[PDB]
Amino acid sequence: KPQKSKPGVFSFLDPLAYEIWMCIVFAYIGVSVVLFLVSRFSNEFGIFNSLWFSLGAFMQQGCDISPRSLSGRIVGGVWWFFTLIIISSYTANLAAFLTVERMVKTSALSLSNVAGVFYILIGGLGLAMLVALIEFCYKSR
Amino acid sequence: SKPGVFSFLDPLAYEIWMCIVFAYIGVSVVLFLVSRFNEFGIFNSLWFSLGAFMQQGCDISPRSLSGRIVGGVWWFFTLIIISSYTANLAAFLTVEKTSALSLSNVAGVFYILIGGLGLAMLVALIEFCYKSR
Amino acid sequence: SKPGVFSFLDPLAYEIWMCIVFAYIGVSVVLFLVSRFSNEFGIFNSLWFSLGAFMQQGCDISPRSLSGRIVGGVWWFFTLIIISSYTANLAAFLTVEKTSALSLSNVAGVFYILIGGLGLAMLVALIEFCYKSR
Amino acid sequence: SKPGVFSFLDPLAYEIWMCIVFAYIGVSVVLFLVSRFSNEFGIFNSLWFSLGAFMQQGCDISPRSLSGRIVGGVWWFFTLIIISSYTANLAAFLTVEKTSALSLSNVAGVFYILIGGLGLAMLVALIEFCYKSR
Amino acid sequence: DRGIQMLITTVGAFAAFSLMTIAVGTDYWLYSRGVCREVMTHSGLWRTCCLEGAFRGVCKKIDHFPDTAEYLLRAVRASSVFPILSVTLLFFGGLCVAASEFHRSRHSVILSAGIFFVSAGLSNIIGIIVYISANASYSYGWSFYFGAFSFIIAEIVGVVAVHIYIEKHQQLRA
Amino acid sequence: DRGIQMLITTVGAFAAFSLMTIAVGTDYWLYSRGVCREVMTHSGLWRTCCLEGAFRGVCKKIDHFPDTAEYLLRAVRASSVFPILSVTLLFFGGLCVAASEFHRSRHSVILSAGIFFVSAGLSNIIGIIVYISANASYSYGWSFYFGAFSFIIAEIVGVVAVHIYIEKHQQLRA
Amino acid sequence: DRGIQMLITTVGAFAAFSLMTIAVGTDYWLYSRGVCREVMTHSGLWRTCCLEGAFRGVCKKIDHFPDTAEYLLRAVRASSVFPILSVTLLFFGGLCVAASEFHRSRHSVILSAGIFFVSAGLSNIIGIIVYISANASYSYGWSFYFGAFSFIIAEIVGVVAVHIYIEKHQQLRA
Amino acid sequence: DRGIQMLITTVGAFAAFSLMTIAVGTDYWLYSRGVCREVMTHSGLWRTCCLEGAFRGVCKKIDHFPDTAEYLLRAVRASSVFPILSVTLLFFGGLCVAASEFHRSRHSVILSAGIFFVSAGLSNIIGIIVYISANASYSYGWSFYFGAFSFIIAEIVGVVAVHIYIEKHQQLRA
Ligand SMILES: CCCCCCCC/C=C/CCCCCCCC(=O)OC[C@H](O)CO
Ligand SMILES: CCCCCCCC/C=C/CCCCCCCC(=O)OC[C@H](O)CO
Ligand SMILES: CCCCCCCC/C=C\CCCCCCCC(=O)OC[C@H](O)CO
Ligand SMILES: CCCCCCCC/C=C\CCCCCCCC(=O)OC[C@H](O)CO
């Protein structure tokens, strides 16, 4: 009888199938490219800001800017709707997925259950500092 | 009965969804009128209301007393209705344990999304050709 | 017996609602004061900022001073706890006399408050007009 | 064991709360550093931006640089997981043996923190005044 | 675009009034099972009528009255005050629209048309909510959807009327 | 508007002080069933008194003392430090309001009135929360609602006092 | 940077078209267990083929047809309209890219390339969603990932094409 | 404020280094029940020691090794690479701070101090998370809190160092 396995560092992904994650990423790119296109059609929604706007919308944050055109607002509106459905579905039972032991009532979450989210965070801060040094040395030359 | 393509709508009765849409229009029209009789013309009123409802926020916020009354009751309505949707959604997603959602369960939300992007591109071509002539 | 028009209040005791309202006023007045010490946070905007924070909306102003940000920060914390607690089981309170859709009758009262508010807004707008027309 | 005055903290272990605070400082310092390299992200606005993101409120300002947006993006992701976990798990604690309303005693601790914070804000405002008066 | 705006306003006002008056008069709000004296029926605000059987086309007046909140709901539903108020306001809106062609001096007439139409739509929403709430398998018929289309048209006409007034006060001030 | 603002301030300050002093003194905070030494009683911060029976109008001192957190709550409730502190601060606020008429040279007096009233209201909120929390069928009486109205008035007066000071520093600088 | 942008565009357009055409043609979309006419198989849009046994390399046509919603899903999946439409649009995008070198007078050609590539990617997303949804242990093979890389490249090329058109309209206006 | 900033930097750098070195060296991270050969023990990164019983004051080298992810966690915890890396970076930060007093021409030295201190704090957070995660009734001792205070001080010193550099590049450019 093996000891019951603790859930993985990336257990926060577990509420959604891998294919939903992949499609969310393609949807994110599609939305961002279409927003840029419609906006150059008629600060501003270049591709980098389109990517930033979409990411903030999805993460339920918001950012500097909001589309002003009709076609930009259609894109924004459907992405907001998509986000509400997907995030609501993802967040429903999230803490249950983070604390589920499987064989290969109400407790507080423990640091071990969310450690992976912390490693991604500190990894990201490291990456940001690295990118900042590059973008510096490039512009220093 | 198997859950449909648009099963994400299931936590609220059809009549709530219909009335949400009428409420959305009413709020947007009244916000426009109390503000006009960076500004709350009809299109921005529609955009403000939509963002509030979808929990996104907006470029702009009403400054008048009557604008803020309208905004404030719409915020209240939104908080109750969205909270009810996600509370009750959680119940529907766990009714026969920790089972991951499948792409088939949410495919309908993706169809609406890509539909919307198509419509946006179409509207953009029109709005172009109209302004080109 | 079907749950009342104001069943959306049911997840919290009456005394929490009363204290939320006093807390709302307290926070708004203190923000005004600290801010007339360091658009701007007059009393009306303080009231609007606090209301938006509580309703998880946000608006056309954020405090810039240290004391303003302390007030804002504790109100944001308060809001996160109270709204999280309120929203946990909300749909259960709306339908209490298996997993069914909410019906329009369960939320009708939220619609009556909304249309009432739109009526009130139009009335206030006519007044504010006729007053300024004189 | 009866639920404490600060029972709203109970869905997360003490060590998560502590690490959230260290993460908050780390994120804020790194965001300041990357930006003073690339209305601006000095340390106090970095702290304010991070706090608003975490509390799901927003902010005056948003990073514009690539490194600023990397930091912002990972903090948004962290926030979405941690807050969602808190409210998911909070819901579980609030319904563990019917629909009973919360009582003021169950949330009194959040009110004490709030009024404490308002007191502190007023004190800081008097200091920041008297310092700038002399 | 003064002509097109006034055309949209006038046609729209007539459309909205007609749709709403038909809806209040006709009996195809709800398709439920029941009895006209159980069988498939079609009901409205006032009458219930059978669609199948020997009594097909017999219509009985509804007994609206077969807690203060429940009593109020029954009363407000029974009277159909909100659908009737919506018809009345649409009537006065259209009246103002007509009067806007004569008394061009007084610009407020077309604005009042606007406010009548906006208010008519709010009355309509309340009516729908009272109707659906009081009814608590079924389906809504075409009378119901006429009320709903009246709401949409009234709100569009309200917005156009308000635009007309704004153009007027922005042309003559400059 | 200087006169009206100072009238609102002065009347308001008196109202708030009076309401709060009555509330702290009187014994209609809570209508619960109990014993004046079970029967329907009316209690306050200090005393419990019967409304029914042979002992109707007999009134006994509360035993506040029949975990550090529990002890602190009992102590703070027993003393009624927060309701009394609210009365004290309202007293000093009103004192400053009076002093603002005489020694006009120093503008900060009316500001200090403002801060006293704002603080009085914060003390009042804490008091209410301690009172309700310590009590854990019942209903609140008029003494309770007097405390609540005192909070509202104090906060309104604080806002007006601060406005007076702003008008003063915006008149005399220019 | 005009040369590099057009190089990225042209190479990218070819890459995306190639990847997508291979993907639609080849049969390593899915590795599931099944029967080529149960054993480990590799399937695609059109055919199922065995990897183990005496029949290793035998390959049978899929029966797409063994509720309106279910029927539509089966039909759309069977036709592979969305993967084929993606290939078609990539073909026309690349055609426009070529035509942009010759008939330079009309700037809109490179823009149309852009719109074709963006649309190709949207068609691709729909295809993937229909494919995965219709299949409801398994794993995806390299043909699947070629479709996915085609989407990414098409979206990058769409963005660069649109950039080319922008600096054209920003150079020649000034 | 150049003097005060450099004082805060230098004292702070020493404080942070000292606290972190003590923490890595000492054995009061965790107060749990266990065995030094069960009894109440105090452990650290390296050793576990008993505080009640006959063996009070005996210390044994921890067996860090009594799934790839579990193995990695055990390895990273066993080495204490992250606490040691934090000490190293604090050492180099303080070294740069010293070097900033001599080579005033080269301003990047104090900035590099800043980046070392910021990075030291990130290494520290990772260490804490690895420590707590690997340990999965208990309580943390003073060695633990020294590591935590080192993190706070390092981040404050990083911020001040970066401010010094900014003041330098904003004084000499103007
Ligand atoms: C200026 C404002 C810009 C406007 C931006 C608008 C975008 C926002 C909303 C989109 C929701 C899409 C509607 C989805 C409705 C689907 C209904 C459906 O599928 O119904 C099935 C039926 O129940 C049989 O089973
Ligand atoms: C520029 C930035 C502005 C900064 C603005 C900051 C305000 C935001 C947060 C407040 C949370 C208050 C935290 C309250 C902690 C209480 C801990 C507690 O009660 O612990 C009990 C313990 O568990 C024994 O039982
Ligand atoms: C500052 C700008 C102004 C903004 C202003 C708009 C904000 C409105 C928000 C919420 C309204 C909710 C009120 C609902 C309360 C009604 C029910 C109630 O109070 O009690 C019922 C009854 O007493 C016992 O049965
Ligand atoms: C546009 C500006 C730039 C902003 C950019 C920042 C936004 C980052 C957001 C989330 C990161 C989450 C990624 C975590 C994925 C790691 C886990 C995973 O993918 O799989 C694990 C492994 O492959 C099998 O064990």
Give the CA distances from residue A27 to residues A33, A35, F150, G124, in Å, rounded to whole numbers and listed in that order: 10, 12, 56, 11
Ligand 1 near A84 CB (within 6 A): no
H or E element that contains A112: helix A111-140
For ligand 4, pick from D38, D77, D78, D80 the residue to mutate: most ligand atoms within 8 Å of CB. D77
Question: Is residue A74 domain-shared with residue A15, that is, in the same domain?
Answer: yes
* Strand order across the beta sheet in which G138-140 lies: G59-61, G47-50, G39-43, G30-34, G138-140
Question: Is residue C73 domain-shared with residue C120, that is, in the same domain?
Answer: no
- The DSSP output letter for H100 is H
The closest of H121, F97, C20 to D108, measured between CA atoms, is C20
Residue H95, classed as helix, strand or coil, is helix
Residue D56, classed as helix, strand or coil, is coil
**Phi first, then psi: what are they for H61, rounded to 5°?**
-60, 130
Question: Is residue A91 domain-shared with residue A135, that is, in the same domain?
Answer: no
Is 1.10.3720.10 the CATH classification of the domain at G1-173? no
The closest of C79, C88, C117 to C10, measured between CA atoms, is C88
Contact H63, H127 (CB under 8 A): no
Contacts of G88 (CB under 8 A, 6+ apart): none
* Residues G61, G62, G68, G69, CA torsion sign: negative
Q: Do A66 and B58 touch (CB under 8 A)?
A: yes
CA of C121 from ligand 3 middle (Å) equals: 14
Question: Is residue D133 domain-shared with residue D114, that is, in the same domain?
Answer: yes
Q: Do A27 and G148 touch (CB under 8 A)?
A: no
Give the CA distances from residue A73 to residues A28, A41, A67, B46, B62, in Å, rounded to whole numbers and listed in that order: 16, 13, 6, 10, 19
Residue nearest to atom 20 of ligand 3 (CA): C6
Number of other residues whose CB lies within 10 A of the CB of residue G40: 13
Give the CA distances from residue G53 to residues G34, G38, G62, in Å, rounded to whole numbers and listed in that order: 12, 10, 20
Q: Nearest residue on chain E to C4, judged by CA atoms? A: E69
Contact C113, B113 (CB under 8 A): no
The closest of A37, A24, A134 to A79, measured between CA atoms, is A24
B-facing residues of E in 95-124 (CB < 8 A) are: 111, 114-115, 118, 121-122
D-facing residues of A in 82-141 (CB < 8 A) are: 87, 90-96, 98, 105-106, 108-111, 114, 117-118, 120-125, 127-129, 131-132, 135-136
Question: How many structural domains is chain A composed of?
Answer: 2
Residue H151, classed as helix, strand or coil, is helix
CA of C113 from ligand 3 middle (Å) equals: 8
Question: Is residue A19 domain-shared with residue A73, that is, in the same domain?
Answer: yes
Distance from C-alpha of H21 to C-alpha of G167, rounded to nearest angstrom: 58
Chain D nearest C-alpha distance from C49 (Å): 11
Strands (E), chain E: 30-34, 39-43, 47-50, 59-61, 138-140
Strands (E), chain G: 30-34, 39-43, 47-50, 59-61, 138-140
Distance from C-alpha of E167 to C-alpha of E164, rounded to nearest angstrom: 5
Number of other residues whose CB lies within 10 A of the CB of residue D133: 6
For the purposes of burial, counting CB atoms within 10 Å of the CB of A74, is it exposed (0-12), middle (13-18) or buried (19 or more)?
A: buried
Chain B nearest C-alpha distance from C130 (Å): 12
CA of F157 from ligand 1 middle (Å) equals: 50
> In the beta sheet, which residues pair with residue G31?
G139
Give F114's contacts in chain C (Cβ within 8 Å): 33
Residue nearest to atom 24 of ligand 4 (CA): A10
Chain A nearest C-alpha distance from H49 (Å): 25
Number of other residues whose CB lies within 10 A of the CB of residue E39: 15
* Exposure string for E147-165, b = 16+ CB within 10 A, e = fewer: bbbbbbbbbbbbbbbbbbb
Give B117's contacts in chain G (Cβ within 8 Å): 122
CA of B75 from ligand 1 middle (Å) equals: 21
Number of other residues whose CB lies within 10 A of the CB of residue H52: 10
Decide the pairing of beta strands F47-50 and F59-61: antiparallel
Contact C28, C43 (CB under 8 A): yes
Give A55's contacts in chain D (Cβ within 8 Å): 73, 76
* Residues H82, H83, H88, H93, CA torsion sign: positive
- Would you list the DSSP string of A26-58? HHHHHHHHHHHHHHHH-----HHHHHHHHHHHH
* Chains touching chain A, criterion 3+ CB pairs below 8 Å: B, D, G, H
Chain A nearest C-alpha distance from G23 (Å): 17
Q: Which two tokens stand for residue H57?
A: 């004051």
What single-letter amino acid sits at E131? Y
- The DSSP output letter for G124 is H
> In the beta sheet, which residues pair with residue F34?
F39
Among candidates G118, G128, G151 on the partner chain, residue whose Cβ is nearest the Cβ of A37:
G118
Question: Is residue B39 domain-shared with residue B53, that is, in the same domain?
Answer: yes
Question: Is residue A3 domain-shared with residue A64, that is, in the same domain?
Answer: yes
What's the domain range around B125? Answer: 102-133
Contacts of F12 (CB under 8 A, 6+ apart): F153, F156, F157, F160
Contact G73, G132 (CB under 8 A): no
Q: Nearest residue on chain E to B43, judged by CA atoms? A: E159
CA of E9 from ligand 1 middle (Å) equals: 28
In a domain, B118, yes or no: yes
Q: Which two tokens stand for residue C85?
A: 């607690």
> In the beta sheet, which residues pair with residue G40?
G33
H or E element that contains G158: helix G142-171
Contact F9, F155 (CB under 8 A): no
Contact H73, H134 (CB under 8 A): yes
Strands (E), chain H: 30-34, 39-43, 47-50, 59-61, 138-140
Chain B nearest C-alpha distance from G119 (Å): 8
Atom of ligand 1 nearest to the CA of A80: 8
Distance from C-alpha of E165 to C-alpha of B37, rounded to nearest angstrom: 8
Contact G154, G117 (CB under 8 A): yes
The closest of D24, D18, D19, D10 to D89, measured between CA atoms, is D10
Ligand 4 near D58 CB (within 6 A): no
Atom of ligand 2 nearest to the CA of C66: 1
Distance from C-alpha of F155 to C-alpha of C25, rounded to nearest angstrom: 8
Distance from C-alpha of E20 to C-alpha of E150, rounded to nearest angstrom: 6
Question: Is residue C61 domain-shared with residue C1, that is, in the same domain?
Answer: yes
Question: Is residue D57 domain-shared with residue D122, that is, in the same domain?
Answer: no
Q: Nearest residue on chain A to H125, judged by CA atoms? A: A122
Method used to solve the structure: cryo-EM
In a domain, D2, yes or no: no
CA of F82 from ligand 2 middle (Å) equals: 22
The CATH number of whichever domain residue B23 belongs to comes to 1.10.287.70
The closest of B122, B115, B109, B96 to B6, measured between CA atoms, is B109
- Would you list the DSSP string of C47-100? HHHHHHHHHT---S----SHHHHHHHHHHHHHHHHHHHHHHTTHHHHHS-----
Give Dmax over CA atoms of chain A in angstroms: 65
Task: Kindly report each contact of residues H59-63 with a partner whose C-beta sits within 8 Å and lies 24 or more positions away, as own/partner.
Answer: H59/H27, H60/H35, H60/H36
Distance from C-alpha of C16 to C-alpha of C7, rounded to nearest angstrom: 15
Give A5's contacts in chain H (Cβ within 8 Å): 67
Contacts of A91 (CB under 8 A, 6+ apart): B86, D80, D84, D87, D88
Distance from chain centroid for Cα D33: 21
Question: Is residue A87 domain-shared with residue A98, that is, in the same domain?
Answer: yes
Distance from C-alpha of A13 to C-alpha of D85, rounded to nearest angstrom: 13
| Backbone break loci in chain F, preceding residues, C–N > 2.5 A | 37, 66, 136
Distance from C-alpha of F74 to C-alpha of C57, rounded to nearest angstrom: 39
H or E element that contains F33: strand F30-34
- The DSSP output letter for A8 is P
Give the CA distances from residue A127 to residues C7, G104, H90, in Å, rounded to whole numbers and listed in that order: 50, 43, 20
Q: Any chain G CB within 8 A of the CB of B99? A: no
Q: How far apart are the first and last CA of chain C?
A: 52
Residue F61, classed as helix, strand or coil, is strand
H or E element that contains F43: strand F39-43
Alpha-helical runs (H) found in F80-141: 81-102, 108-135
- The DSSP output letter for C9 is G
Contacts of C9 (CB under 8 A, 6+ apart): C17
Contact F158, F115 (CB under 8 A): yes
- The DSSP output letter for B12 is B
Question: Is residue A84 domain-shared with residue A100, that is, in the same domain?
Answer: yes
For ligand 3, pick from B30, B63, B73 the residue to mutate: most ligand atoms within 8 Å of CB. B73
Crossing angle of helices F2-25 and F81-102, rounded to 10°:
150
Residue F35, classed as helix, strand or coil, is coil
The closest of E122, D1, F165, F102 to B26, measured between CA atoms, is E122
Contact C58, C52 (CB under 8 A): yes
Resolution in A: 2.6
Q: Which residues line ligand 3 (CB under 6 A)?
A: B 68-69, 72-73, 76; C 6, 47-48, 51, 113
Q: How far apart are the first and last CA of chain G?
A: 19
CA of F22 from ligand 3 middle (Å) equals: 29
Question: Is residue D113 domain-shared with residue D87, that is, in the same domain?
Answer: no
Provide the phi-psi class of B61: left if phi over 0, else alpha when psi is between -120 and 50, else beta: beta
Distance from C-alpha of H158 to C-alpha of H151, rounded to nearest angstrom: 11
Contacts of D36 (CB under 8 A, 6+ apart): D42, H162, H166
Contact A131, A138 (CB under 8 A): no
Q: Do H115 and A129 touch (CB under 8 A)?
A: yes
The closest of A78, D134, D24, E135 to D32, measured between CA atoms, is D24
